[PDB]
Scaffold this motif. Structure first.
Motif, PDB file in Angstrom:
ATOM      1  N   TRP A   5     131.266 108.416 -24.240  1.00 17.01           N
ATOM      2  CA  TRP A   5     131.407 109.813 -24.651  1.00 17.01           C
ATOM      3  C   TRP A   5     131.403 110.778 -23.440  1.00 17.01           C
ATOM      4  O   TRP A   5     132.150 111.765 -23.422  1.00 17.01           O
ATOM      5  N   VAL A  35     127.748 103.375 -25.197  1.00 18.79           N
ATOM      6  CA  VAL A  35     128.363 104.337 -26.115  1.00 18.79           C
ATOM      7  C   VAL A  35     128.272 105.756 -25.519  1.00 18.79           C
ATOM      8  O   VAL A  35     129.278 106.459 -25.461  1.00 18.79           O
ATOM      9  N   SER A  63     124.932 101.317 -36.879  1.00 18.64           N
ATOM     10  CA  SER A  63     125.921 101.222 -37.964  1.00 18.64           C
ATOM     11  C   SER A  63     126.894 100.018 -37.806  1.00 18.64           C
ATOM     12  O   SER A  63     127.570  99.641 -38.757  1.00 18.64           O
ATOM     13  N   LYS A  64     126.946  99.411 -36.614  1.00 20.28           N
ATOM     14  CA  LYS A  64     127.781  98.225 -36.384  1.00 20.28           C
ATOM     15  C   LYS A  64     126.977  96.910 -36.545  1.00 20.28           C
ATOM     16  O   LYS A  64     127.497  95.850 -36.209  1.00 20.28           O
ATOM     17  N   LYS A  69     122.581 105.613 -33.394  1.00 21.99           N
ATOM     18  CA  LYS A  69     123.077 105.543 -34.775  1.00 21.99           C
ATOM     19  C   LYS A  69     124.407 104.761 -34.846  1.00 21.99           C
ATOM     20  O   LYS A  69     124.614 103.985 -35.787  1.00 21.99           O
ATOM     21  N   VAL A  70     125.284 104.938 -33.845  1.00 22.97           N
ATOM     22  CA  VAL A  70     126.568 104.236 -33.788  1.00 22.97           C
ATOM     23  C   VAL A  70     126.324 102.725 -33.654  1.00 22.97           C
ATOM     24  O   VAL A  70     126.916 101.922 -34.379  1.00 22.97           O
TER      25      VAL A  70
END
Ligand SMILES: CCOc1ccc(S(=O)(=O)O)c2ccccc12
Ligand SMILES: CCOc1ccc(S(=O)(=O)O)c2ccccc12
Ligand SMILES: [Ca+2]
Ligand SMILES: [Ca+2]
Lengths: 206, 206
Positions: free
Chosen positions: B18, B14, A204-205, A200-201
Motif C-alpha cells: 500500500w 501488505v 480474511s485470506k 484484517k486483509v
C-alpha cells in the motif's frame, strides 16, 4: 484547482502520519526480535518518511524519539557513529539524552533503563581500550548516586575494561530491560490504522 | 508463536504494498507539478520501502519501473549520474531502456515519448560539449527511421550543439509528453487504498 492541490497535500500528510506509525511499530518489533537487517532497512524507511512530514503532533514526535532511541541503543557499541552535531557524544550518551526527553512515565523501569545506559556508556569505552574517553563520558553523564558514581570512577582509573560490575549490569541486561519497554510500545501501536487494516486483509485470506 | 510472526510479516508486506502505491502516486504528482524537492524526498521514501519488499506482483514491478523512469527522466541533464552498472549509460538511455520494458500499451504517445527521449539523449551530450559521447550514445540507441538517424548524425558531426532540430523536439516537449502519460498513471492510482483512505479523512473534516 489550487484547493485540490491543498487537499492532496493534506491527504499526503495523513498518509505519511499513518506510515510513520506503522514503520515505528515495525522497527520496535525488529528490535525486540533481534532482526538486525530488518531494523536497518525499516530505519531507512522511517527516516525517509519523516523528512516528508512538516507538522508533527506531540504523539508523532514521541514516536520519532523512540525510533531514534532504539537506533542509538542498537548502535551502542559502534563508537565510530556520530549521532549529534557534537562529535564527542557517544551513541549511548545520545540515547540517554533522548530517554530523558521522551514524554513518558518515569516509572521504575524507566530509571533502571537510564542507570543501565549510564553504566554501559562507560563500559563500551573501557571494552575498546578508550580509557580517556570513558573518563570524559563519565564527567558528561555525572546529584547522582555517589556510591554508584564512585565505583565507576574507580574502575575507569583501574582501567579494568573487563570488570565484574559490568556483568551484574551487562549490555544484555540493558537490552532485555529496553525490550520489555519496547513490548509495551508494541501493544499501544499494534492498533494503529495501517497495521490494523493490513492485519484484517491477512486474516480474511485465512 | 511462530505463526504470529508469519502473520505479522504478511501484514508488513501488505502495508509495504500500500505504501509503494501511495509513494508512486505522490512521485507522479510531484513530477507533473514540477515540485523538485518533493520528488527528491518521495524518491528516497519509495526506494527505502521497495528495499523492504521481497515478493513483487507484476503490477508492483510496473509501478517501480515508472518511478525509476521518472527519476531518470528528471536526471536527464545530469550526465554525472550513473543509473546502471555500466558507467557509460547516460540517464536518458537508462530511461529509454525502462520505457521499452514497461508492460504497457504501445500507443502513439508511447512512440512519441520514445523518439523524444532518443533525440534528447544525444542533445544533452551536445549541449555539454561532449561530442564524442553523443556519437557513442547514437551508436547504442540506433531498423530505426533512417532519415531521422541521418539527421542526428549530421548534427553530431557538425558539432552544432545548439541546432534547430532540438527546438522542434525540445527537452520541454519531451517533458510535456511525459507529463501527459503521468496524468493517465495518476488517474489509475488515485483510487489505491492509502490515498483513498487519506482523502476520506480530509473530506470528513471539511
Ligand atoms: C528525522 C529523521 O529521522 C531520523 C533521523 C536520524 C535517525 S538516527 O540518526 O538514525 O537516530 C533516525 C532513526 C530512526 C528513525 C528516524 C531517524
Ligand atoms: C529498487 C529500489 O528502488 C529504486 C532504485 C533506484 C532508483 S533510481 O536509481 O533513482 O532510479 C529508484 C527511483 C525511484 C524509485 C525507486 C528506485
Ligand atoms: Ca568515536
Ligand atoms: Ca558521465
Amino acid at each position: 484547482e489550487e484547493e485540490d492541490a491543498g487537499l492532496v497535500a493534506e491527504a499526503e500528510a495523513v498518509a505519511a502520519g499513518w506510515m510513520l506509525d506503522f514503520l515505528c511499530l515495525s522497527l520496535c518489533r525488529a528490535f525486540r526480535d533481534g532482526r538486525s537487517e530488518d531494523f536497518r532497512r525499516t530505519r531507512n524507511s522511517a527516516e525517509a518518511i519523516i523528512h516528508g512530514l512538516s507538522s508533527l503532533t506531540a504523539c508523532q514526535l514521541r514516536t520519532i524519539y523512540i525510533c531514534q532511541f532504539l537506533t542509538r541503543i542498537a548502535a551502542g557499541k559502534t563508537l565510530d557513529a556520530q549521532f549529534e552535531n557534537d562529535e564527542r557524544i557517544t551513541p549511548l550518551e545520545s540515547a540517554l539524552m533522548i530517554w530523558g526527553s521522551i514524554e513518558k512515565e518515569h516509572d521504575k523501569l524507566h530509571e533502571e533503563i537510564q542507570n543501565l545506559i549510564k553504566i554501559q556508556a562507560i563500559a563500551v569505552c573501557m571494552e575498546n581500550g578508550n580509557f580517556k574517553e570513558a573518563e570524559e563520558v563519565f564527567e558528561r553523564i555525572f546529584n547522582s548516586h555517589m556510591p554508584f558514581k564512585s565505583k565507576l570512577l574507580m574502575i575507569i582509573s583501574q582501567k579494568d575494561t573487563f570488570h565484574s560490575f559490568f556483568q551484574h549490569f551487562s549490555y544484555n541486561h540493558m537490552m532485555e530491560k529496553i525490550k520489555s519497554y519496547v513490548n509495551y510500545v508494541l501493544s499501544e501501536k499494534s492498533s494503529t490504522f495501517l497495521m490494523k487494516a493490513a492485519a484484517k486483509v491477512v486474516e480474511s485470506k485465512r
